[PDB]
DNA sequence: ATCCCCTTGGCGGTTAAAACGCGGGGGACAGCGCGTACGTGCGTTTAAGCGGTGCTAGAGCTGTCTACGACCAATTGAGCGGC
DNA sequence: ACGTACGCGCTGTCCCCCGCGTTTTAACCGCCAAGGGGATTACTCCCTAGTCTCCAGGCACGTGTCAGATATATACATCCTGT
């Protein structure tokens, strides 16, 4: 008997095949991507919590992360991310 | 003959007096104008607390004090009493910019 | 009697899981309320990040003509970009080594 | 209305006093322009964070509260104005 | 069971190869022992923190998760072992 | 006579060979002995997972090679190619430890 | 009137008179001390959160925060703080 | 009222509000965009018809337009176009 | 008891119509039958091209410190881009003029 | 199986004979390189198109019919191979 | 929706802020060797690496239970506002 | 163990910067109008957490297979050597 350990397996595999169908994966690289997504997630999450404390809002909306991604993410990366999330949330509200 | 001090002695007197000094070392109003200048480079018609001008003033001067104490460490490592810009550049590189 | 199941990722057209990140923000204990656009926004941000870095890593793997990505490809991918360098200056990569960085004085002549 | 040079208002003698605090005893002329440059870089980063706070605060006047918040985020936490 | 002299376990050619990866051409003789010392104090911090994590867990075996976690709270996060 | 390369180009060959390589330059067994020894210096009879020893090995690997690239920056600051341990003490001080 | 804006003025004044009855206090120094209280408190609270989630603990106890003190506070300051907190919690449990 | 002269009006304004919220649109620039969409649609539809006749196919699905995008649009834009078109058809299959 | 009329463009997550593009493919007389991927794919490539060229148009307008897009900005935006130029070599923009492309020897010394 | 550099298989006197059909009296030695380069460019375009045609048709052998289709697309319509 | 207050806007006197020139005078730095010290080329050895074997410590999961602590209405009091 | 190479001590040598010193000018000081926004308060709506139920994608497991791990023979790069 084994307990399942959660990871970011199929999502990184699918996004790689969406960007490069003919490029393979090694498992140590897969661990590096697991640690990357966990690290950046906790960075944004902690910054969002600090903003919620800071403006005394009891909530984290899309606007808090919008603020947080010009906080941590730089510039063109941040503005492309803002655009991606903006179109994502418009598709989400349309669905 | 009018009396004149040797170079560095007035400099070291300034060192001792202004490590002894605790006040703000920058003129207030041009710093306020500069932070407003950078503000309208970002958002239009934006306003500041005077306390915020104080806060950026004291943070800016202390941050610069950090860069320059790193600059002395680099310069004595470079065996120079006259610093150069490359000292500050290397300090920015090592500090984790 | 019941609506058919559609994931929020398919509603947003993302393939990172919106529900997983929403759970992990609930149980990451960052606020007692979270706006609904927040986790899908964050998942889209990581989607852009992972897509960017997998473009870079796949391109590097083609440049060293290897079919499978390796942490060396990842470490070249991060370190050959400026804004990812600022994003991950303080990050250690296992078996990624170091970017090829020789100073000009280390060269002969 | 608009202003085009107040970077020089942090003057050459003012930069001289600032380096006198750091213990710097001889300063060539080439240092000062790069010091105002990195002053612009740091304060640009801080005020970017600050206006991002401020626009997120849905206000139009910057307080020292978001200033010390941004100094906390950048890693140069300031004592004296918290709370 | 007791070990005495594992500072010399990190051999001089290992140190030279380390500095090869860091791009050092020439390595003077005084470097090896004090680099052993600074590796020692770095592991004193990291292992003290990680072992403190373990004894917080009421575990007896040090895990890689605690090594990367004690790394990460020192601003030295590592990728590749469950972080 | 057997062929002999000049002092330095074998070192640069080792350089180029090792940024093209990824392999962990520290021997596994004495590193595991060292981590058990340092841990035994604090708390007794302490066991290490092999994954923990390996993970700490690339950790220490990256920490020191960051320190050596930083001291190479300090050396080209000091007009030098052979680093000396005051470069490392400088790097420790201006990094802030 | 105004809403009550909270600060650590009185208690630092209390410990001030406790350890130096003859000395005075300034407003700038008091703001520095309030920022110090806030800074050290938030560092320990953040590390206590990390210890809570690394062990999947839903609570932060004296063991959790005690460990966090050994992490944050160095050396003899750490063990003196352990001694003070242990004496304090034994006095607290003595009611 | 008169008969409706169909155009791409609201679509160009909403895609601009996605990509640049603050800038405005002139009627001349809007006519340029209408004639651009007319030209590119005409080119791709005509080449799709060409591939329909050429492979003796009465059917034109996304695969022939992927063929046509690989034909007409050069390189970088071609693979970009294939990427978001593949994302679009996958969200179409997922409805 | 009919389902709510929800749009195929939002099913694509897009803005250029599946409906209008499918209608002009059917009534443009290009094939007897048209697959469902055809109008969504072609609307997607038009939306990509439109977003790219209005990105360059907006940057061109802000470079000229102006707010509203003009065909001068459009023509400038087209012939800064090599693959757009190769796409639109034989097309003339109304009121766009010519981007400054001055050959060197006719410039004064 | 794999080849590297057969582009000189279109020999220089072949290019000379081509220019004699093109009515060029004097062909510089510099000329042959960009003729090979533009021939590479044109064939790269044509074979890209033709490969796209064949891969659309789910085949593995290029027909001349697909070649003349590629010449229809790019605007160099050729007569005499079943177009 | 408001209110009221600290910033914004404008005004008058002054002297330090600065600022620029003169002049002294302190400084970086190439470089020419010299001291020397690792760098590199080998040989030697030995212990790490590799492969195989037996033990069991404790990691981790499961069940039990109970130790522990937010909530809430309420009472009150000590610190916040104000002078 | 041979040996080239690096660290550098000192010292001229241009050379740039500190310091004094008068002048000029704009912040400092101190002084008034005011209003816009910071900040506070009532409302009612936006929004999200949370349970029950149900399903469906995502991870453990196995495996089997071709990209890669390993092996062997030339070509050139390089790096010293020789005229």
UniProtKB/Swiss-Prot annotation, chains A, G, H:
The modification Omega-N-methylarginine is found at residues 57, 63. Keywords: Acetylation, ADP-ribosylation, Antibiotic, Antimicrobial, Chromosome, DNA-binding, Glycoprotein, Hydroxylation, Isopeptide bond, Methylation, Nucleosome core, Nucleus, Phosphoprotein, Ubl conjugation. The modification N6-acetyllysine is found at residue 56. The modification Phosphothreonine is found at residue 86. The keyword DNA-binding applies. It is found in: Nucleus; Chromosome. The modification Dimethylated arginine is found at residue 50. The modification N6-methyllysine is found at residues 17, 79. The modification N6,N6,N6-trimethyllysine is found at residue 56. Belongs to the histone H2B family. The nucleosome is a histone octamer containing two molecules each of H2A, H2B, H3 and H4 assembled in one H3-H4 heterotetramer and two H2A-H2B heterodimers. The octamer wraps approximately 147 bp of DNA. This is Histone H2B type 1-K. The chain holds residues 31 to 125 of 126 of the full protein.
Curated annotation (Swiss-Prot), chains B, F:
Acetylation is generally linked to gene activation. Acetylation at Lys-86 (H3K122ac) by EP300/p300 plays a central role in chromatin structure: localizes at the surface of the histone octamer and stimulates transcription, possibly by promoting nucleosome instability. The modification Phosphothreonine is found at residues 44, 71. The modification Phosphoserine is found at residues 21, 50. The modification N6-methyllysine is found at residues 1, 20, 28, 43, 86. The modification N6-(2-hydroxyisobutyryl)lysine is found at residues 20, 28, 43, 86. The keyword tRNA-binding does not apply. GO terms for molecular function: chromatin binding; DNA binding; protein heterodimerization activity; structural constituent of chromatin. The modification N6,N6-dimethyllysine is found at residue 43. Keywords: Acetylation, ADP-ribosylation, Chromosome, Citrullination, DNA-binding, Hydroxylation, Lipoprotein, Methylation, Nucleosome core, Nucleus, Palmitate, Phosphoprotein, Ubl conjugation. The modification N6-(beta-hydroxybutyryl)lysine is found at residues 20, 43, 86. It is found in: Nucleus; Chromosome. The modification N6-acetyllysine is found at residues 20, 43, 79, 86. The modification Phosphotyrosine is found at residue 5. The modification N6-crotonyllysine is found at residue 20. GO terms for cellular component: extracellular exosome; extracellular region; nucleoplasm; nucleosome; nucleus. The modification N6,N6,N6-trimethyllysine is found at residues 20, 43. A lipid is attached at residue 74 (S-palmitoyl cysteine). Its main location: nucleus. The modification N6-lactoyllysine is found at residues 20, 43. The modification N6-succinyllysine is found at residues 20, 43, 86. Belongs to the histone H3 family. Core component of nucleosome. Nucleosomes wrap and compact DNA into chromatin, limiting DNA accessibility to the cellular machineries which require DNA as a template. Histones thereby play a central role in transcription regulation, DNA repair, DNA replication and chromosomal stability. DNA accessibility is regulated via a complex set of post-translational modifications of histones, also called histone code, and nucleosome remodeling. This is Histone H3.2. The gene is H3C15.
Curated annotation (Swiss-Prot), chains C, I:
Residues 1-9 have a biased composition (Basic residues). The keyword Acyltransferase does not apply. The chain holds residues 11 to 119 of 130 of the full protein. The modification N6-crotonyllysine is found at residues 27, 109. It comes from the Eukaryota. There is a cross-link at residues 4, 6 (Glycyl lysine isopeptide (Lys-Gly) (interchain with G-Cter in ubiquitin)). One of its GO terms (molecular function) is protein heterodimerization activity. Keywords: Acetylation, Chromosome, Citrullination, DNA-binding, Hydroxylation, Isopeptide bond, Methylation, Nucleosome core, Nucleus, Phosphoprotein, Ubl conjugation. The gene is H2AC4. It is involved in the initiation of both imprinted and random X inactivation. Ubiquitinated H2A is enriched in inactive X chromosome chromatin. Ubiquitination of H2A functions downstream of methylation of 'Lys-27' of histone H3 (H3K27me). H2AK119Ub by RNF2/RING2 can also be induced by ultraviolet and may be involved in DNA repair. Core component of nucleosome. Nucleosomes wrap and compact DNA into chromatin, limiting DNA accessibility to the cellular machineries which require DNA as a template. Histones thereby play a central role in transcription regulation, DNA repair, DNA replication and chromosomal stability. DNA accessibility is regulated via a complex set of post-translational modifications of histones, also called histone code, and nucleosome remodeling. The nucleosome is a histone octamer containing two molecules each of H2A, H2B, H3 and H4 assembled in one H3-H4 heterotetramer and two H2A-H2B heterodimers. The octamer wraps approximately 147 bp of DNA. The modification N6-(2-hydroxyisobutyryl)lysine is found at residues 27, 65-66, 86, 109. It is found in: Nucleus; Chromosome. The modification N6-succinyllysine is found at residue 86.
Curated annotation (Swiss-Prot), chains D, E, J:
There is a cross-link at residue 12 (Glycyl lysine isopeptide (Lys-Gly) (interchain with G-Cter in UFM1)). Changing residue 72 to R: In TEBIVANED1; results in severe early developmental defects when expressed in zebrafish embryos; results in defective cell cycle progression when expressed in zebrafish embryos. Changing residue 79 to H: In TEBIVANED3; results in early developmental defects when expressed in zebrafish embryos. There is a cross-link at residues 1, 12, 40, 60, 72 (Glycyl lysine isopeptide (Lys-Gly) (interchain with G-Cter in SUMO2)). GO terms for biological process: chromatin organization; negative regulation of megakaryocyte differentiation; nucleosome assembly; protein localization to CENP-A containing chromatin; telomere organization. Changing residue 13 to L: In TEBIVANED1. Acetylated as part of spermatogenesis progression prior to histone-to-protamine exchange. Demethylation is performed by JMJD6. Changing residue 75 to R: Found in a patient with a neurodevelopmental disorder; uncertain significance. It is found in: Nucleus; Chromosome. The nucleosome is a histone octamer containing two molecules each of H2A, H2B, H3 and H4 assembled in one H3-H4 heterotetramer and two H2A-H2B heterodimers. The octamer wraps approximately 147 bp of DNA. Found in a co-chaperone complex with DNJC9, MCM2 and histone H3.3-H4 dimers. Within the complex, interacts with DNJC9 (via C-terminus); the interaction is direct. Interacts with NASP; NASP is a histone chaperone that stabilizes and maintains a soluble pool of Histone H3-H4 dimers. Belongs to the histone H4 family. This is Histone H4. It comes from Homo sapiens.
């Amino acid at each position: 008997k084994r307990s399942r350990k959660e990871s970011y397996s199929v999502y990184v595999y699918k996004v790689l095949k969406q960007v490069h169908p003919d490029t393979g994966i090694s498992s140590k690289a897969m661990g590096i991507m697991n640690s990357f997504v966990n690290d950046i997630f906790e960075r944004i999450a902690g910054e969002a919590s600090r903003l919620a404390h800071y403006n005394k809002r009891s909530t984290i909306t899309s606007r808090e992360i919008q603020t947080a991604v010009r906080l941590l993410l730089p510039g063109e990366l941040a503005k492309h991310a803002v655009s991606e999330g903006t179109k994502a949330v418009t598709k989400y509200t349309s669905a | 003959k009018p009396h004149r001090y040797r170079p560095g002695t007035v400099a070291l007197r300034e060192i001792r007096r202004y490590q002894k000094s605790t006040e703000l070392l920058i003129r207030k109003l041009p710093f306020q104008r500069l932070v407003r200048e950078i503000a309208q480079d970002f958002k239009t018609d934006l306003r500041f607390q005077s306390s915020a001008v104080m806060a950026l003033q004291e943070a800016s001067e202390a941050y610069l004090v950090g860069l320059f104490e790193d600059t002395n460490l680099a310069a004595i490592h470079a065996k120079r009493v006259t610093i150069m810009p490359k000292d500050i550049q290397l300090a920015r590189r090592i500090r984790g910019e | 009697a019941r609506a058919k199941a559609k994931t929020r990722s398919s509603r947003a057209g993302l393939q990172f899981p919106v529900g997983r990140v929403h759970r992990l923000l609930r149980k990451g204990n960052y606020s007692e309320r979270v706006g609904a656009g927040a986790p899908v926004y964050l998942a889209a941000v990581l989607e852009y990040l992972t897509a960017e870095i997998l473009e870079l890593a796949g391109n590097a793997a083609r440049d060293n003509k290897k079919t499978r990505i390796i942490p060396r490809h990842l470490q070249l991918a991060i370190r050959n970009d400026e804004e990812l360098n600022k994003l991950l200056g303080r990050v250690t990569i296992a078996q990624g080594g170091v970017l090829p960085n020789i100073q000009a004085v280390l060269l002969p002549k | 209305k608009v202003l085009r040079d107040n970077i020089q208002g942090i003057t050459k003698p003012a930069i001289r006093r600032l380096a006198r605090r750091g213990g710097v005893k001889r300063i060539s002329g080439l240092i000062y322009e790069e010091t105002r440059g990195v002053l612009k870089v740091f304060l640009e980063n801080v005020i970017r964070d600050a206006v991002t706070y401020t626009e997120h605060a849905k206000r139009k006047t910057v307080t020292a509260m978001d200033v010390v918040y941004a100094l906390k985020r950048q890693g140069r936490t300031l004592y004296g104005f918290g709370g």
